[PDB]
Amino acid sequence: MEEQDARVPALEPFRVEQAPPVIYYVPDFISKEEEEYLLRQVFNAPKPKWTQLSGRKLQNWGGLPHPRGMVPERLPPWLQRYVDKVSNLSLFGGLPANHVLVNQYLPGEGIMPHEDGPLYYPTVSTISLGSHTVLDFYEPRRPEDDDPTEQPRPPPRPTTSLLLEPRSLLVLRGPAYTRLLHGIAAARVDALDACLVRGTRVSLTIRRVPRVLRAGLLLGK
Ligand SMILES: O=C(O)CCC(=O)C(=O)O
Ligand SMILES: [Mn+2]
Numbered sequence: 662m663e664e665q666d667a668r669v670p671a672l673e674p675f676r677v678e679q680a681p682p683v684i685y686y687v688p689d690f691i692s693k694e695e696e697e698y699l700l701r702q703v704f705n706a707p708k709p710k711w712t713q714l715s716g717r718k719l720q721n722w723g724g725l726p727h728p729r730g731m732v733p734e735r736l737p738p739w740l741q742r743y744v745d746k747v748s749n750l751s752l753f754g755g756l757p758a759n760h761v762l763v764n765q766y767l768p769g770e771g772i773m774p775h776e777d778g779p780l781y782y783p784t785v786s787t788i789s790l791g792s793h794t795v796l797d798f799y800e801p802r803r804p805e806d807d808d809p810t811e812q813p814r815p816p817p818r819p820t821t822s823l824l825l826e827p828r829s830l831l832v833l834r835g836p837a838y839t840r841l842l843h844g845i846a847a848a849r850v851d852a853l854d855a856c857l858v859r860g861t862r863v864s865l866t867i868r869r870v871p872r873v874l875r876a877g878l879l880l881g882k
Contacts, residue, residue, distance in 0.1 A: 667835030671750060680821050681798065683835040690830035691743070696790050702739045703763055703790075703863050716847065717770050723760035723870070726780040729882060730874040736761065744867055747786040752832060753869035754782050762866040766794065766845065768859045774799050774844035782869040785833040785843075789825045792860035795851045796823045796831070799842040819844075824853070 667683040677684040691699070703720065710720045722740050724731040736744055740761045748757035760781075764772070774797070777785055797819035820841075825831060833843070851857045874880070 663835050681837050681841055684837050685832035687830040689828050691828045696828050700790055718765045720763035726870045729880045730872045731870045733873050747867050752784045752786055758867045758869045760868050760870045764864045766862045768849050771845035771847040774842040776842055783838040786867045787831040788865040789827055789829050790863040792862040793857050794825050794845050794862050796825050797844050801842055
C-alpha cells in the first residue's frame with residue numbers, strides 16, 4: 662500500500678523502474694535561463710542567509726524546521742515560482758510545499774548518508790543546478806534486523822546510485838523517503854563505466870513542513 666499510495670500518475674513516464682519504490686527523475690524540468698536566474702539569486706542573497714557546515718554551505722527559505730513547530734518566513738517569488746510548479750504535481754499530500762533548502766557543494770563536497778525524517782511530509786523534490794552529481798542510496802539498519810551474533814559483513818556500499826544532471830527534478834516518495842538512506846560522496850569525479858568532472862552544484866530541495874506556528878508565535882526550549 663505504501664508503494665501504491667506513493668505513485669504520481671502524471672510522473673509515471675519518469676519512474677526510475679530499477680530503483681526502489683518510488684523515485685521519479687524528470688530531465689530538463691527547468692530551462693537554462695531559469696537555472697541561470699536561480700544561481701544568480703542564490704549567490705546574491707544576503708551573507709546572513711548562509712549556514713557553514715563541516716562539508717557544505719546551505720540556505721533555509723520558509724523558516725527553520727523544528728520538532729516543536731517552524732517559525733515561518735515568506736518565500737521570495739524567485740523560489741515560490743518552483744514551489745508552485747512542484748506543488749502543482751500534488752507531491753505533498755494535497756497542501757503546497759512551504760520550505761526550500763539550498764545546498765551548495767564545491768568540487769569534493771557531499772552529504773553523509775541520511776534519511777530526511779519526520780519534520781517533512783514524506784516526499785523529497787530536488788531541482789539540481791550548476792553541475793551533475795551522483796546520489797547514492799543505502800539500505801538502513803532497522804532495529805528489528807539487529808543480529809549481535811552475525812558473521813563478518815563488508816562495509817556498506819550503495820544499493821543503487823543515480824546520476825543527477827543539472828536542470829533535473831528528482832522526487833523520492835514511499836520507501837525511497839521512509840526506508841532508504843541517500844548521500845552524496847565527497848568526490849571530484851564520477852566514473853559512469855565515461856567520466857564526469859564535478860563543478861559547483863547548487864540544489865533546491867522543496868519539501869512540505871507540516872508543523873508550522875501561527876504568525877508571531879515563538880516557543881522557547
Ligand atoms: O543536494 C541534494 O540533492 C541532497 C540534499 C539532501 O539530501 C538533504 O539536504 O537532505
Ligand atoms: Mn536528504
